[PDB]
Structure 1
Amino acid sequence: KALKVRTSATFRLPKTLKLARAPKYASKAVPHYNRLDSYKVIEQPITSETAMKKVEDGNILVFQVSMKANKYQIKKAVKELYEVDVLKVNTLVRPNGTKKAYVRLTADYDALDIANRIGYI
């Protein structure tokens, strides 16, 4: 018979039960594959007269990398395609559109031994 006591002078929206999605059909019905593969992060080795001086002397393995890749996706792509640990990942956007990647390897892993192993020197 008695009503509910209200200690506050403001009526607000009551918390209701919000249901989760139980859809009748998938939105696109196909799980799309990896848009940026491990073979799509790295795309071209850079062989200039200055990039080869960083391989032999500075222990810097220079790659050309796509525009949709950060420093995270370059480090896990060298460790997967080569099994070579990476200390730092250094990126710059080239003035002609693409992105240059300076990857310095560890002291235990030499950069000249991986250069002639894959084919560019």
Structure 2
Amino acid sequence: KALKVRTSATFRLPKTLKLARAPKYASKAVPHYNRLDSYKVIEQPITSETAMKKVEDGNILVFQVSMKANKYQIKKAVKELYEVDVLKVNTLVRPNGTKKAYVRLTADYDALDIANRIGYI
């Protein structure tokens, strides 16, 4: 017989079989529990008097919130821990390195009403 027939003069690395990992032992013994559940996302109410106003006037709950949490995780956490529906979530880093979430509830909920059925006032 005889030879191959390459019409390209560039020789490339043969596309060769890639096996997937089948360990002889488990990477880390026990997976870590959820590192950011809702009780870690939303830390306290903020009950500053100018916050207490957004509640009365703006249908808005202010929370000190985990620095590690994003608008997604803040929104879900409120929704879960409070029954409440969220319209949008504004956030900001305070000047003491902690996060403030301005949470607007939809028109069906009275945030003031929530506020005292959660406790503060």
Class of the TM-score when normalised by the shorter of the 2 chains = over 0.9
CA distance in 1, matches of 2:72, 2:119: 26
**Between Structure 1 and Structure 2, how many residues are aligned?**
121
Name the SS of the counterpart of 2:58 in structure 1: coil
CA distance in 2, matches of 1:108, 1:37: 26
Q: Offset of 1:66 from its aligned partner? A: 1.0
Q: Offset of 1:2 from its aligned partner? A: 1.1
Q: Which runs of 5+ in 1 are unaligned?
A: none
CA distance in 2, matches of 1:90, 1:115: 18
CA distance in 2, matches of 1:8, 1:74: 56
Is the aligned partner of 1:100 residue 2:100?
yes
CA distance in 2, matches of 1:82, 1:36: 17
Name the SS of the counterpart of 1:115 in structure 2: helix
CA distance in 1, matches of 2:29, 2:9: 51
Q: Offset of 1:83 from its aligned partner? A: 1.5
Please report the RMSD computed on the Cα atoms of aligned residues, expressed in angstroms.
Answer: 0.7
For residues 3-60 of structure 1, the C-alpha deviation after alignment (integer angstroms, 9 at most, x for no partner) is 1101001101000110000000011111110111110000110011100010001111
CA distance in 1, matches of 2:105, 2:74: 12
Given the two structures, how large is their TM-score scaled by the length of structure 1? Answer: 0.97
Name the SS of the counterpart of 1:15 in structure 2: coil
Percent of matched pairs sharing the same residue: 100
Ranges of 4+ aligned residues in structure 1 off by more than 4 Å = none
CA distance in 1, matches of 2:115, 2:60: 11
Q: Which runs of 5+ in 2 are unaligned?
A: none
